Design an enzyme around this catalytic site. Structure first.
Site, short mmCIF file in Angstrom:
data_model
loop_
_atom_site.label_atom_id
_atom_site.label_comp_id
_atom_site.label_asym_id
_atom_site.label_seq_id
_atom_site.Cartn_x
_atom_site.Cartn_y
_atom_site.Cartn_z
CD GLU A 244 30.78 6.35 12.76
OE1 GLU A 244 30.46 5.14 12.86
OE2 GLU A 244 31.69 6.88 13.44
CG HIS B 180 33.52 3.10 13.53
ND1 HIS B 180 32.29 3.39 14.08
CD2 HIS B 180 34.32 2.60 14.50
CE1 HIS B 180 32.37 3.04 15.35
NE2 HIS B 180 33.58 2.57 15.65
#
Ligand SMILES: Cn1nc(-c2ccccc2)cc1C(=O)NC1CC1
Ligand SMILES: Cn1nc(-c2ccccc2)cc1C(=O)NC1CC1
Lengths: 296, 302
Positions: free
Chosen positions: A254, A272
């Site tokens: 991420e 996210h």
């Protein structure tokens, strides 16, 4: 004892809950304001690595206003006798609502339709969608979020099946989830949503083998943890048409460096955003501050 | 109504339903303008999809024609002007496409709360913007449902599972009928300041044209999110742009426009606007149902 430092953008409720004194800052480097205080409250951006734990010897407790502790080194915390606390229930409804939104977007290609409309096109023949009524939804992991996804999708006439080795078939039945052996789940699903924790057995739960066992044209949702759905196997399933579409809120890395998945026409994604609601943020901030105040 | 011609290709059940209703059926496909006229000569009914064009010349030549059945709700291949002149009845399938429209509506509400289409565009541009897309939780929020028919009730029960408060108004639907599906009816003026979300499920009529306008947007709670998966014109498009520009409307989800496709792109191009090219009935399931629903309507006449 008693003195807290907030290093991430939290709800103002976290501050008003005092306890005694709080010092709040944001977007700090590894070098930061490195003077920390006995308490540290983080979200996800601030990295509580081995070095910052060692540099702040006076620090007694590290708290996260969210689920899990990915940004906090547990091994380094247990080394200096520092307790780690988080809010496992603060994000529940927001992650569930986002998952439900992802199923909707997958069945009707809403993000692709919006993108096409913004491209100055009116192509209604291109976007031939699927009705959720009567379709089978597979829920892997029947904890709090899995249960909330289930009751919401039951209102859409979706047949809710699933598996969880901790939640008994009798307990899942009481919230409308028909439990079957994991191998029997794959061939029946039109849609699959994962809500299992990230574990050695759940790493690549959806892989080349389990994707081959799926019904051709299956739709997959991952709003839980990056790695549950093998990202390589998912791409191969999308390229062959074994997987008709995928919705991803979480990734193994991420932000994702590998762009092949994100760039796929049948893939819809979010950076996210599972816990990214003002309601989940206020709950997480409230729940972490009260357990920090709780100290006696 | 004795003989019905199915000019297009649908489901084989449609012919069977008409046959059970005691009607003579002739099923053919890809007929020319000249051949369609000859076949219709002893037909009072015609069942069409989108391929067969029921032009003025066809209508005027088929003098025994009384009813034209269409595979879905909307407009495309039939000349309504010529059909109104000859007194021919045109049939559509609202309850057969209802479910898919209700699901799209629910999808649009979830999309508005979390900006899923926008987040996807951002991700496809190689961006990772967490702070930009701070969303809202549907649980505990108030959804206003303006129009409490088949779509309105289906949206209501689905959104009630998300812990949303479902309030609304419909002059045709009784307070008792709406209470049976957990929707508390209140007059229009009381609805506007209570809603976090508003969805319209009414036909397009002068009483529903510009239902959401400058006056009603000012009465709305600041940051209201609006959904229009019904008919283009219910939400005044000019008024909606002004509400988005000031922040009075936090976002809008539009499956329908006053003109389709719209020439004015300001709404579609707005960052807080989610849109689809009229996909409310665009599912394999709803398309497979409309043929069966026309047959039922033709039999419900005899
Ligand atoms: C250990 N574990 N394994 C799975 C699982 C489910 C489906 C498929 C594969 C694995 C779920 C869990 C788990 O921790 N459940 C907790 C009750 C909430
Ligand atoms: C004519 N009409 N007007 C409205 C309406 C609703 C809210 C506000 C203003 C007007 C609804 C209807 C209507 O046909 N309902 C039928 C059950 C499907």
């Amino acid at each position: 004892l008693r003195k807290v430092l907030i290093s991430d953008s939290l709800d103002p409720c976290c501050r008003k809950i005092l306890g005694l004194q709080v010092v709040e800052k944001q977007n700090l480097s590894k070098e930061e304001l490195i003077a920390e205080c006995e308490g540290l409250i983080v979200r996800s951006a601030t990295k509580v690595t081995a070095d910052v734990i060692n540099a702040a010897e006076k620090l007694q407790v590290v708290g996260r206003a969210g689920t899990g502790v990915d940004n906090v080194d547990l091994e380094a915390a247990t080394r200096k006798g520092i307790l780690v606390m988080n809010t496992p229930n603060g994000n529940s409804l927001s992650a569930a609502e986002l998952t439900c939104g992802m199923i909707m977007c997958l069945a009707r290609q809403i993000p692709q339709a919006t993108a096409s409309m913004k491209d100055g096109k009116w192509e209604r023949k291109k976007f031939m969608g699927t009705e959720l009524n009567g379709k089978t939804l597979g829920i892997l992991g029947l904890g709090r979020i899995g249960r909330e996804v289930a009751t919401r999708m039951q209102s859409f006439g979706m047949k809710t099946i699933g598996y969880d080795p901790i939640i008994s078939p009798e307990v899942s039945a009481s919230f409308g989830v028909q439990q079957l052996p994991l191998e029997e789940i794959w061939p029946l699903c039109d849609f699959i949503t994962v809500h299992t924790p990230l574990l050695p057995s759940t790493t690549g739960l959806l892989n080349d083998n389990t994707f081959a066992q799926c019904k051709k044209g299956v739709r997959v949702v991952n709003c839980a943890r990056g790695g549950i759905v093998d990202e390589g196997a998912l791409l191969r399933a999308l390229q062959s048409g074994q997987c008709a579409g995928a919705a991803l809120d979480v990734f193994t890395e991420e932000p994702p460096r590998d762009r092949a998945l994100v760039d796929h026409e049948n893939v819809i994604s979010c950076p996210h955003l599972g816990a990214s609601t003002k309601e989940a943020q206020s709950r997480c901030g409230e729940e972490i501050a009260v357990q920090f105040v709780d100290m006696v």
